[PDB]
């Protein structure tokens, strides 16, 4: 089974350096690009860095540019993130995210979990929380600055869900396709500049924080967290 | 034999509108 396990975190004094490691057991790590996505306490997700399958193309975030290094060890099946000159704003909950890019592929599916504490398309959801009684379809809306519709017919919008105390999991990839192992109640639709998420039924499993992300260009910007709860 | 040939011609004429190879597709519409 797929299993990404991250370690190397802890408490770091300001201005220090550290290394975060991630084992990638249970799948072909050589054919999957890897992303680092952190989450500040009581905040949303923000992309950090990305490395391709062949370690040819490497991308960073403007906040961590020139400060963070991302490396891949294919023979050992491991991902490394080296951080230096840390600041108090680096406290987050880092996650290693799988990806793979071909025709019909579904990137950003499997995540992990690790904790680190230190002593551009605009995507946001204005609705902080949407309380709703179970039994009726619930709609979640996410706003974007540019248009995610591409000349080839692709709309790079990603719908993820994070349950309390858990890790985010991919609900919908490319704004119209559901990830494997998901209930059929979830659906997604929308225009080039507007998108919507529909949930047919609500259960104890469906309560959580919903996030919207764009993959049109780097850096990948997340939306706001819609707290769907009963 | 004649009925089969007539049916073949009728089917060919009915679906002759949607043959991208028969009618040169415009470059903008060309995949």
């Amino acid at each position: 089974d797929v299993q990404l396990v991250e370690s190397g975190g802890g408490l770091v004094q300001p201005g220090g350096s550290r290394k975060l490691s991630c084992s990638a057991s249970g799948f072909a790590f050589s054919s999957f690009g890897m992303h680092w996505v952190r989450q500040a306490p009581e905040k949303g997700l923000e992309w950090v860095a990305y490395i391709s399958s062949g370690s040819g193309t490497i991308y960073y975030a403007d906040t961590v540019k020139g400060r963070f290094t991302i490396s891949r060890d294919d023979p050992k099946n491991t991902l490394f993130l080296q951080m230096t000159s840390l600041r108090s704003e680096d406290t987050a909950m880092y996650y290693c995210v799988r990806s793979i890019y071909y025709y019909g592929s579904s990137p950003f599916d499997f995540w992990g979990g690790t904790t680190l504490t230190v002593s551009d398309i605009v995507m946001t959801q204005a609705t902080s929380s949407v309380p709703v009684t179970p039994g009726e379809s619930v709609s979640i809306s996410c706003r974007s600055s540019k248009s995610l519709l591409h000349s080839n017919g692709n709309t790079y919008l990603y719908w993820f869900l994070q349950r309390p105390g858990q890790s985010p999991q991919l609900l919908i990839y490319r704004m119209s396709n559901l990830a494997s192992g998901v209930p059929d109640r979830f659906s997604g639709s929308g225009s080039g500049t507007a998108f919507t998420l529909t949930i047919s039924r609500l259960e104890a499993e469906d309560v959580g924080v919903y996030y919207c992300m764009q993959h049109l260009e780097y850096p990948l910007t997340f939306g706001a967290g819609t707290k769907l709860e009963l | 034999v004649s009925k089969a040939a007539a049916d073949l011609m009728a089917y060919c004429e009915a679906h002759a509108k949607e043959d991208p190879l028969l009618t040169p597709v415009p470059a903008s519409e060309n995949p």
Binding site: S31, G33, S52, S53, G54, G56, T57, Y101, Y102, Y103, S105, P107, H150, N152, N154, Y156, H215, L216, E217, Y218 | -
Partner: protein, 213 residues
Amino acid sequence: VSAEDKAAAERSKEIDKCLSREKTYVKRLVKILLLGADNSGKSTFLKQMKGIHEYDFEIKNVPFKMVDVGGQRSERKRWFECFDSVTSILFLVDSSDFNRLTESLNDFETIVNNRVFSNVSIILFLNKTDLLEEKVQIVSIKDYFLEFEGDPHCLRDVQKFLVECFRNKRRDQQQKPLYHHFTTAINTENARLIFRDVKDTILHDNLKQLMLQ
């Protein structure tokens, strides 16, 4: 070309690099197709050194692949066209055998006279030659071959007559050379002969490529 199409292009580049990394091996590979008979001793010859078998080995830093199609071989040209790229065709026969000589000669004539293998050299092996002298001493040659001329009890004459009869089945001589060998069932020097014949075939190919004539 979006941010995800660039990654797909990079993956395609990696795949193409992987394919091109092994393009030297396919050129360096030397293919020999085995077309022996049941009584020829093909199994013993293979053990010394439709079930399709492939034996891959290395001789003098040269990769050799022997394709054994024993059990079922079709006469359709589509089946035979799959082996038009092999370097050599090895034909194994039983020299000591008497009644099977005509059938093996017919098989050799059918194999050689096909246009599919016009660019493939033919190697001939005559196994179990240690019993050939005893067989020719017990029973002469002229009895089983009216056209034979010479001493029926001379081993060299018998070998020469067999070689001539085998080579007479070649309708065309200009295409590729035809070779021959005489080995027993216990010797372990057939690999050197195979390598020498492969080198001779390669030299002939280079001569034809050089357009020296």
